[PDB]
Design a protein around this ligand. Sequence first.
Ligand SMILES: *C(=N)[C@H](C[C@@H]1CCNC1=O)NC(=O)[C@@H]1[C@@H]2[C@H](CN1C(=O)[C@@H](NC(=O)NC1(CS(=O)(=O)C(C)(C)C)CCCCC1)C(C)(C)C)C2(C)C
Ligand SMILES: *C(=N)[C@H](C[C@@H]1CCNC1=O)NC(=O)[C@@H]1[C@@H]2[C@H](CN1C(=O)[C@@H](NC(=O)NC1(CS(=O)(=O)C(C)(C)C)CCCCC1)C(C)(C)C)C2(C)C
Lengths: 306, 306
Amino acid sequence: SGFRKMAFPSGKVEGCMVQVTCGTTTLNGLWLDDVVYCPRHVICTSEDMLNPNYEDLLIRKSNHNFLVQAGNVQLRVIGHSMQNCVLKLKVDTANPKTPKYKFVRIQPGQTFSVLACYNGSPSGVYQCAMRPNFTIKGSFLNGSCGSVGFNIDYDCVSFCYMHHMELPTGVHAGTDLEGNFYGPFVDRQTAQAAGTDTTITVNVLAWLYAAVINGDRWFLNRFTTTLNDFNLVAMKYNYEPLTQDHVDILGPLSAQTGIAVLDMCASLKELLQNGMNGRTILGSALLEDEFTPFDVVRQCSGVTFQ
Amino acid sequence: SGFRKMAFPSGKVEGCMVQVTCGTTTLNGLWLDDVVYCPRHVICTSEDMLNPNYEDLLIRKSNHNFLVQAGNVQLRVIGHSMQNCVLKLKVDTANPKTPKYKFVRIQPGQTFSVLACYNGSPSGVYQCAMRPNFTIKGSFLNGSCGSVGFNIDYDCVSFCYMHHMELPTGVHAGTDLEGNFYGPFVDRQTAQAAGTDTTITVNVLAWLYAAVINGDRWFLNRFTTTLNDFNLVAMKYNYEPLTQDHVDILGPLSAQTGIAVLDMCASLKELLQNGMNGRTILGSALLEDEFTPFDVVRQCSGVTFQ
Ligand SMILES: *C(=N)[C@H](C[C@@H]1CCNC1=O)NC(=O)[C@@H]1[C@@H]2[C@H](CN1C(=O)[C@@H](NC(=O)NC1(CS(=O)(=O)C(C)(C)C)CCCCC1)C(C)(C)C)C2(C)C
Ligand SMILES: *C(=N)[C@H](C[C@@H]1CCNC1=O)NC(=O)[C@@H]1[C@@H]2[C@H](CN1C(=O)[C@@H](NC(=O)NC1(CS(=O)(=O)C(C)(C)C)CCCCC1)C(C)(C)C)C2(C)C
C-alpha cells in the first residue's frame, strides 16, 4: 500500500552527464556514444542573448573553444554541429556507459523523471508532467541547463526533455533531444508568455483510482454520467476534455477496482462542484493531476526495470 | 526557482541490490563488499510467522538453503549470521560496485530517499521522512522487503533504513542496517500499533521559508512571538514542540530571507488558528512537513554529489 510521487531510478542517466564549457558559460551535456548534446545557447555571451544569430555565432567557434569534462577526464572535441536548438559535440571517446536509449517527443499530460544536474554532477531526481501549455513545473537553478528528462521502458532509457530556460512565472521550458522546443518558445531573451494552463483530467481520474485502490473511498457515489455531460462541467472549471481514448486508457484501473470510468467521472463532477470540504485524498487537499494511468498501474502493481 | 519533492540520485545504490531466496520466499538484499544484508524474516515459513524462534530457525539452515542472485550471476553463500533483525550472508565475491558508505541510525523528522525494489531490481525512488511515531509513509508491495533508505553526503552513501513490514493503517516499519527496529515493533505477525503521529514543526517552518524564497509571501505578518507562546499553540494542534536547537538549525534560512525564526513562528501560529482559507503555498493546500532545513538549503542553493 501507499502512494508516493515516484521517479525512475537514475543510475543509467547519471553515467551520461558531463560538463560543457564555452567561454565563461558552463552547463551540462548528455554524452551518448561519441556525441555530447547540450543547449545551443551555451555559445552566447551577454550581448548575444537579446537577439542571437546562432549560425553566425557557431561559425566563429572552433573545436577547441569547447571544454568537455566527464569527471576529471577531459574529452577532446573533434567536430561540432547544430540541430535545431541543440548543439552536437563529436568527441574522440565513446561513452563506455551508454545505455540502450531512444529519443522521444512526448505529449502534454505525460510524465517523466528529471535528473537535475550542476557542473556535470547529479543533484537530485524528481517526477513532473508536461503541462497542457508545454511548460513543466520544475526545480532548477543557475547552471542547470542541459539537465534531461527521461522514462525507462524495460531496459531502454527514453530521453524526452532537455532543460533550457525559466519563465517569469517560475516554470520551465526546454526541448526534445532533437532540439525542438515544446511550446511556442525560442531561445532568446525576449518577452515570451505561456498559454493558460489547464488541469489534466485523465490523470486526475487515474489518481482517484489509486485512492480507491489504497482504501480512500469517501468521494464515491452511486451516480453515473455521460462524456458529454461530464465535459460540459469540466470545461467550466478549466479541465481538459475527456475523449474516448482516455476512457479506454483507464480500462485496466476500472477493471481492477470494478468502478466504471463514467461512474468515477460522476464523482469527479461532484468534487468540482462542491469541493472537498476539508477532507483529503491520498494525503492531498487538492486534486492531483501529475500521475498518468500508467504511473498508477506501475506503482500499484510493482513493475521493475532491467 | 521551483520546489519539488526531490530524491537523491540512486545510481550508487542500484548496483548494490540483489535478490535473496530462501525456500519459497524471495525478497531483496543489500550487497556491500562480500556481505549481503536482508531482513531475517526471509527464513520464516507461514507457520513460523505468528511466533518465530529465529535462533532455532537459523540453526536449521545451511549455506546452500540461501539463493542469492546479482542479475544473472549467482553468488555463492559461504557463511551466515544474524545481527538483531537482519541476516548477514557472507558470499565468495566482493561487490566490485561497492560505494563509499556508512550505516547511520536516523532520528524522527529526518528525511531520506527510498529505492523501492522487487526481485533485486529497482522499481522507483522517492523521498520520505521518519515520522515522530517511527513509521514511514512509504509505497511498498509484496516482495519489497530489503529495499533500503539512504542519503548521500558528498561522495558517501549513508544507509539508514531497510524495509520489513506494513502496518494495518497502510504505513511502513523497518530497521537500521544493524538490524534494530525504529519504533516499538518486532518482526512477528502479532497485533502491533503505532503511537499517534505528530506534525514535524521545524520542517514546516523550513518549508515556509522555501515558499518565501520562491515568492509565496501572503502568509507573512508583522508580528513576532516567543518560543513559549508558540509551543503552547503548537501542542494544541499536535505539532512537535520547538526547541532552541531547531531555531539555530533554521539560522541560514532566516539569514537568507531576512525573516527571523520567531517572526515566521508568528505566521505559522496564524495559519494554525485560521487555516489557509483556500489559498495554497508552493502548490499545496496543507502544511508540508517532509522537508528538513537541510533539504530546503540543498534544493534552493544547488548542492551536488560526487
Ligand atoms: C541554464 N543553465 C539556465 C537555467 C535557468 C537559471 C534559473 N533557472 C533556470 O531554469 N537558463 C538560462 O540561462 C536561459 C538562457 C538565457 C537566459 N535564460 C533564462 O532562463 C532566463 N529567463 C529568461 O530570459 N526568460 C525569458 C525572458 S524574461 O524572463 O521574460 C525577461 C524579463 C525578458 C528577462 C526568455 C525565454 C522565454 C521565457 C522568457 C533567466 C531565468 C536566467 C532570467 C537563455 C534564454 C538563452
Ligand atoms: C516484505 N517483502 C513484505 C512487505 C509488505 C507487503 C505489502 N507491503 C509491505 O510493506 N513484508 C512482510 O512480508 C512482513 C513480514 C511478515 C508479514 N509482513 C507484513 O508486512 C504483513 N503485515 C503484518 O503482519 N503486520 C503486523 C500484523 S497485523 O497486520 O496487525 C495482522 C492483522 C495480525 C496480520 C505485524 C508487524 C507489525 C505491524 C502489524 C502484511 C502487510 C503482509 C499483511 C512479517 C511481519 C514477518
